[PDB]
Amino acid sequence: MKVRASVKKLCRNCKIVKRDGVIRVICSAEPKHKQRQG
Template structure:
């Protein structure tokens, strides 16, 4: 299975209970054990 690409969106939100909103290098990101939920603000 291929890794899901990070979605780049103007606003990031938690999609499920396991999503975590974090800051990395000044960017807001969502990480989750469901790879489809990966998002980055940009």
């Protein structure tokens, strides 16, 4: 999990999701692409 202030889609499979008021990036392909704004 990358916890950074600027979360972005890193590939085609990255999806932006907002869970409990937290912007997150989930990627079905690359586990390295998992991010969360913080």
